[PDB]
Amino acid sequence: TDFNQKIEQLKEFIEECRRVWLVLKKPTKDEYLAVAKVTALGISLLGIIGYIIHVPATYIKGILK
């Protein structure tokens, strides 16, 4: 029984989410671009350093293993 209730309710709340939604802002080539640009940038920035450290430090572990 209760199960039916809750099921009836979620359907309601979820519908309450409606009147709330219908808003989201799709990104514009301009904004989207600029952003995704900084993201990848920082990503590679955090990646490189790990490389500079890793790669070689393994050339060692490896040539002395």
Binding site: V20, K25, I43, L46, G50, Y51, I53, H54, K61
Partner: protein, 430 residues
């Protein structure tokens, strides 16, 4: 009364009320970043140069690296935080932080546990057969180093947290993923090459470039999602205008939250295998390294290289499973830690000056009403995204990429709020 004695014994970091220049917060952060790589690279002192593959599931979230001085990484700290949110979350240990007591209680306490979980994980790791040779003597030695390295991070986090920019954890994670990418794709045994070479060799291997694509796609997707937002707040309109909204929950709301959901699963695949080759199959039958049956199995993220269709049901469960945990964490974080009332209102209204009126009652109500979308959704969604981000699968981690990208942007913001606060020595709250 509380565990205040040993709690007062646990060192902390000296926070200077002096002038900490942007240039210094920056330079500081950087020093932490590097010491991170050093450890993440250095291997743990252990004669058994032979280690049983790796746990392609814990690293990412735990942004660490098995076999190195940081083989446990942020893992403990996260675990710890997970429990707290669990207790102080399901009311089990109801606490109204408000007072600097509960606040500093919840904290100090968790910190300790972090050191507890620091060793536990260590032992659990070796006990899960993360290295192969259980020489009671050698085993002991290892555990030492292991958990002690993670300790350094706990304190390096503290440093960044009070001497630089952004956050240790946040950083650290982004630190790892970024590297995992730049190296995996371009490093020594780099993929871009393995692919490029495969082209030259004359046998174009779509499996060498694949994972690299996986990452672009994710990044692109994850970013879009990280964009979603509301809008003023005044009109401008476009324009402006004066006053001053006005936000609109989004993705970074359920950040720390999802970090905990994924981390929960992290401690299950670890805790199951651990309590597998060291007892009874409570959680699942691993074999082959990871798990091939049990709670463990149904709760193991599918990513790595390519998406696995050959197990629909497996997908479904995971997804739904991840969603539940996500929502749970999100709630235990708002009970909690989500846009409060005091501070909110207290500050709010401002833009004192013709442009022309202001605000007042009713506004708060409306906001709260049209604000119950985040928390639940924010996470429910994210968690979904994160998960699906894994089916697709990508370098560094389908779910990890989501955090990184976010952490990196919240880290850009940090760099700006700073570039400015470095001018008007006062508005350190607007």
């Amino acid at each position: 009364k509380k565990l205040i004695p040993i709690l007062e014994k646990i060192p902390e970091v000296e926070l200077p009320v002096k002038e900490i220049t942007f240039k210094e917060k920056l330079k500081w952060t950087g020093i932490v970043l590097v010491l991170y790589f050093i450890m993440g690279c250095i291997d743990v002192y252990t004669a058994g140069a032979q280690i049983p593959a790796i746990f392609e599931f814990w690293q990412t979230i735990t942004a660490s690296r098995i076999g190195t001085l940081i083989t446990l990484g942020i893992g403990p700290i996260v675990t710890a935080g997970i429990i707290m949110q669990l207790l102080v979350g399901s009311g089990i240990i109801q606490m109204d932080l408000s007072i600097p007591e509960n606040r500093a209680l919840f904290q100090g306490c968790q910190k300790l546990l972090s050191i507890i979980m620091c060793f536990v994980e260590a032992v659990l790791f070796v006990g899960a057969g993360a290295f192969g040779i259980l020489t009671p003597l050698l085993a002991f030695l290892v555990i030492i180093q292991i958990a002690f390295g993670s300790i350094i991070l706990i304190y390096l986090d503290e440093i960044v947290s009070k001497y630089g920019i952004g956050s240790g954890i946040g950083l650290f994670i982004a630190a790892g993923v970024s590297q995992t990418i730049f190296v995996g794709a371009l490093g020594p045994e780099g993929y871009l090459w393995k692919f490029l070479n495969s082209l030259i060799q004359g046998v174009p291997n779509i499996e060498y470039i694949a994972p690299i694509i996986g990452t672009i796609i994710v990044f692109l997707m994850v970013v879009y999602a990280e964009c979603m937002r509301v809008e003023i707040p005044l009109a401008h309109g476009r324009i402006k205008g004066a006053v001053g909204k006005y936000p609109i929950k989004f993705v970074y709301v359920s950040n720390i939250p999802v970090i905990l959901a994924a981390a929960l699963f992290a401690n299950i695949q670890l805790w199951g295998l651990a309590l597998y080759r060291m007892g009874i199959p409570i959680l699942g039958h691993y074999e082959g390294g990871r798990a091939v049956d049990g709670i463990a199995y149904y709760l193991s993220t599918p990513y790595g290289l390519s998406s696995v269709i050959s197990d629909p049901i497996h997908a479904i469960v995971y997804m739904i499973a991840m969603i539940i945990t996500c929502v749970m964490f999100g709630i235990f974080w708002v009970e909690t830690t989500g846009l409060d009332p005091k501070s909110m209102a207290k500050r709010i209204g401002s833009l004192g000056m013709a442009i022309k009126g202001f605000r007042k009652s009713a506004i708060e109500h409306r906001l709260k009403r049209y604000i119950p979308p985040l928390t639940v959704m924010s996470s429910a969604f994210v968690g979904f995204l994160a998960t699906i981000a894994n089916f697709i699968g990508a370098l560094g981690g389908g779910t990890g990429v989501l955090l990184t990208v976010s952490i990196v942007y919240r880290m850009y913001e940090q760099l700006l709020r700073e570039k400015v606060s470095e001018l008007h020595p006062a508005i350190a709250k607007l």
